Symmetry: D2
Subunit: 386 residues, 4 copies
């Protein structure tokens, strides 16, 4: 019941099911996973593919010879399973040299090193067939106010993404970039903290059409924001290139719970929107099986991500297909929201006495929105109470 297939386009980072459980107060509770074992185990669970940071796949400092061996082993697992690699990304956050950032480190030589490390992995991502290159600037930011001039940092950030876009276009690569916002952690404040800040920054890049966002459920919720709303704005701008699905219990540290956990109703409205909008990218799970779990709990948690998506997809489809819901949507004037306010144009609106001089403001004010009956229909559908 509710079984995923590779057509559902579910993907997982190596670093997700492979998280050993080391947290700021505790050592690892699980041994490291061979990326080949993860590929095979995820393929049996019905996943469509995997993603990776460079350092998840090739241990940091690997010689060029060890590097090729690690890739060849990985490629063979992809060939044996049919798994794809739709997305890749760079680790610009773990090694101590990145303690003040990569692209916006105050030290110029670290910024150049950061760009060279990224470019090396773009080549590899393209070799493996990735369509999207994600950038999560986890160390770009500050704990104190004088440490970072944010306008200079934004200049440096734009400079880095512009150079990466020059590299991609000069190589003829068919790959696009996706900025993954996060409001804080591990820096006190992280630059481009939300979907909106990333969308606004992109519009200042030399080639804006190469760049979109990879929003994460938990990250926008770490600022108390409505994740489905943020996704709707990304869709409206044409910039939802990729998405990270997981769960988060409000404003606290980045929990990365399995998808469906955390804010369940938000997950429902997210699935409703992705499916209604015809999102056709990967459904990527950026999550961490809790460190209480052994390896069987890891795979149970990963299976749960997929199951919860498929259950919510069924309930959202049932909600939208229900005539009583369709009738309720009309009662709340969702149909009117979709109509132009003034397709008759400015001058017609200015001479339309029914818009102002003869508008009956009290009759309008008295009409109820009927939103609560609509939301209870939505609740009943989610819970399978109809």
């Amino acid at each position: 019941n509710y079984q995923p297939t590779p057509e559902d386009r579910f993907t997982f980072g190596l670093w997700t099911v492979g998280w050993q459980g080391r947290d700021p107060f505790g050592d690892a509770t699980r041994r490291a996973l061979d990326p080949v074992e993860s590929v095979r185990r995820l393929a049996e669970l019905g996943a469509h593919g995997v993603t990776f940071h460079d350092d998840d796949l090739i241990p940091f400092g690997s010689s060029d010879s060890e590097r090729e061996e690690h890739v060849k082993r990985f490629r063979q697992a992809l060939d044996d399973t049919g798994m794809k690699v739709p997305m890749a990304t760079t680790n610009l956050f773990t090694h101590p040299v990145f303690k003040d950032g990569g692209f916006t480190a105050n030290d110029r030589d670290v910024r150049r090193y950061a760009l060279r490390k990224t470019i090396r992995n773009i080549d590899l991502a393209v070799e493996l067939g990735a369509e999207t290159y994600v950038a999560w600037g986890g160390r770009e930011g500050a704990e104190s106010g004088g440490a970072k001039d944010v306008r200079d940092a934004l200049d440096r950030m734009k400079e880095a993404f512009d150079l990466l876009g020059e590299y991609v276009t000069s190589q003829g690569y068919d790959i696009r970039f996706a900025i993954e916002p996060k409001p804080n952690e591990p820096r006190g404040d992280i630059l481009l903290p939300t979907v909106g800040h990333a969308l606004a920054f992109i519009e200042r890049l030399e080639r804006p059409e190469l760049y979109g966002v990879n929003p994460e459920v938990g990250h926008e919720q770490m600022a108390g924001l409505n994740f489905p709303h943020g996704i709707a704005q990304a869709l409206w701008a044409g910039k939802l290139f990729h998405i990270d699905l997981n769960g988060q219990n409000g404003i606290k540290y980045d929990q990365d719970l399995r998808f469906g956990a955390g804010d369940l109703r938000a997950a429902f409205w997210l699935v409703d929107l992705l499916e209604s909008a015809g999102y056709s990218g990967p459904r990527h799970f950026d999550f961490k099986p809790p460190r209480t779990e052994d390896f069987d709990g890891v795979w149970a948690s990963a299976a749960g991500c997929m199951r919860n998506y498929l259950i919510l997809k069924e309930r959202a489809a049932a909600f939208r297909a229900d005539p009583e819901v369709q009738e309720a949507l009309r009662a709340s004037r969702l149909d009117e929201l979709a109509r132009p306010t003034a397709a008759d144009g400015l001058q017609a609106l200015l001479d339309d006495r029914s818009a102002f001089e003869e508008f009956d403001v009290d009759a309008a004010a008295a009409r109820g929105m009927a939103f609560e009956r609509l939301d209870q229909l939505a609740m009943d559908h989610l819970l399978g109470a109809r």
Copy 2:
């Protein structure tokens, strides 16, 4: 000591010192202020001018005759005091007809009414000499997921701002718009919830150059965000048209405390940035004297907004003028942050072996940022301990 003058460009909304103290659980604790009395009292405190919503100045439903009388009285107070009106805005939030929004109400006739109400007040703002027209979409949003298709709402929002920009340009008005973001309250979630979301939306408008942001200290702090960072991004984009100054104690209801209260260190870094960047707009206080206060407390609170700005301006100037601070900034490589990462260009960076092949990552990793000594210098300056 620390006395404001009209050259300091301090401005106040009528609705700020005029807030009667009605909150969701309590009745008014103060009688209504005549806008003429506020103008005269603020001018004696050293303010530079006032702002208004249409309904602050002209009671809702006023005949055209009463309207002219209210304006004429107000104009005479401006002439007697020398006070300016740099900014005006529309009340699209108080009257029950706006309970589901103005520009993005589901009811089309309310949206048209909302546009006509705004256009009427733009004419008045221009008559009074306002340079900036603010839009705070306080009712644009939702409490439940099905109530608002956010993509349709964004279409309607863009349609409204586009029509207003057509109106302004067709009249030849020299006025620009400034969107005031707020993440929530009074709606469960408000559209365009942060500075970043508003900046991104503007880039989809037909005439983006007419529109900027009017960020509010407390609003970005209601999402846990770093307000000086958000202001830096607005400045970097060239979009800080106006700013609302006040105080807020973290993530809760919109307190609108006087400026300097709330997050004091954030206020310091904000003043440092506005003054370093040469912000030359109004320093507008969107605040509410607490309802514990009588009228003398109102004017004490308003004087405090200005005093705290002027004290922080002095401490920030002293901080930046201090040679030991200038030396510390170099020690933390703020000077390197301001230099291009790769002005030698992509190809030079790709063949620069010192950026990767021969980069000594451990030597780089070992260099301390010296951020804590810098921040303690900043703390000592703020507290006048040097």
Copy 3:
């Protein structure tokens, strides 16, 4: 399907379905309800009873004659419907005299007035058969640090509750008190901000056994806290006298959404706990139908509170009755959590070499908790996917 009966003990405040929609930025969108009409409408929806503040029932300033008339009318509606009044409370927050508190106002004469106003309504509550008297100190607190010495305020707060307990015991009344915590709003910070702070304060009162807590879902969530955990601590202490059910979307202003909205999974675990623990008090809904709604939306929202409770009660019962869940609970050692750590006593534990000297810490560390499979069983039950 899922129909409430008066045996389900669902109750509503007059002020809930009677909220006119006035918020800090907007006027009322609904006319005032006659308390008699609310009683009759709620009884037809299946409610068991109503609660009231004194000022909900008797308009403030009413003569003793008008007072008796208002009570007599109300009593007749209770007799005609069979509705009970299980709980009553005092409005110590709306009138401007309470702007700095009632029990902990800095002005002594306001504190005495506050006590006399409460005592008058205790008499009335007892006349109407109320078992619980709630105290929500909404104005007890401060916006600034010097305004309130909190130790003095706590002395005054204890003095007030002690005098009320003396009054009750001297009259021979069979009524107990329940403190309703709230972390903030309308004060910047409210005293006794959470369930824990109220539980701790009670233990310093002269007659602790007269006092318990009335926790509210949304209030503990306004501090980011786990409401089921807080309820479990109240139960463990024997102090859950009453409970307020509603919904809240994280850390922001007090939304008072209908129960089931907000954090749906938290609502599920709350119902599971109340029913497992055999809570037998009223299921009270302290909620506000959103101001978008007309009167039909009001009653739809109130019906939804009850429906969602009954749906969650069914899913929690199914979860706990499921053998596979019972097996999973054993796999995660919930049975071991319920056993004493050291019923053999201190000396036995100190000489038990298997507890330390020969404890195999790595074998213990390797056992997975199996929490994720358990939580997915809980998710599947909630969603009716088994």
Copy 4:
């Protein structure tokens, strides 16, 4: 200027200045510190003493022989410097065996192991002269609702603290316990999440007088709570045995910034209260020098903790000594807050017509609190603008 002396009672955990910089996304940026070097370096900065977890001082798994050697080395550093050890604590959070808790682990054998590990370190703490034994239940809690029955966990938690109190009293030790609350991180929710919940729990222990709280600035701020208020309640209950000082920027992950950073005004009101109340315990800094820092930044950060305390102590003393402030406090009726509401007793209050029948509610309502002028005096003192 502002130099600490050992009479200022400033103390530091070994784990604070010794934090290597490993965070959930990054490796260590600093080498490990020898506890002897920390003792000597802190003594030269003017600290009064150090605290430790067992595993900070004796590496986990150390033979009894290595153990004695580690203690002897440490003792010699204390003797050479004059440093005290006022407080000690147990690491029940790092090792994987504690992944589901120590005292409230679901596995009974882990709970017994947890108690034996604690008891071993109590003996050592007493040997070294510690007055307070802290308990921070960082792993006691859950990420999902079914994983932990909170009433059973509270039974287990009480059982553990009761056994520890039996051990202490049976040995005749002069040591008291202090529970350190934290709302979340590393568990999704932690048991006894705030000062209030810990104070309430203590009152159910067999020997409540052995137990108090060790509140941490940042932890209560992680729930959005007012830390000075929480400290005032702890003082009022007589339970502030110890305190952890640091900085935190609102509701997010546990930053542990140096004291004075984060909420500066809250730090001021905290110092004002500790000094006014005559707190005479250690001023303990539970902080982490940011991982951007090298070892010189570590010691600069630690010096800053102490400096900021001493600057704030001076400004708070100046504030309270200022006649104009003393006059303002009377104007705001702080003197009336400190007087009994009804020392004349219940019957006198019931027959006092000036408390109700003849109370002039409108005259009372019209009196302003004058809180804003008071708070601006407090602001001017903090900033040294008088």
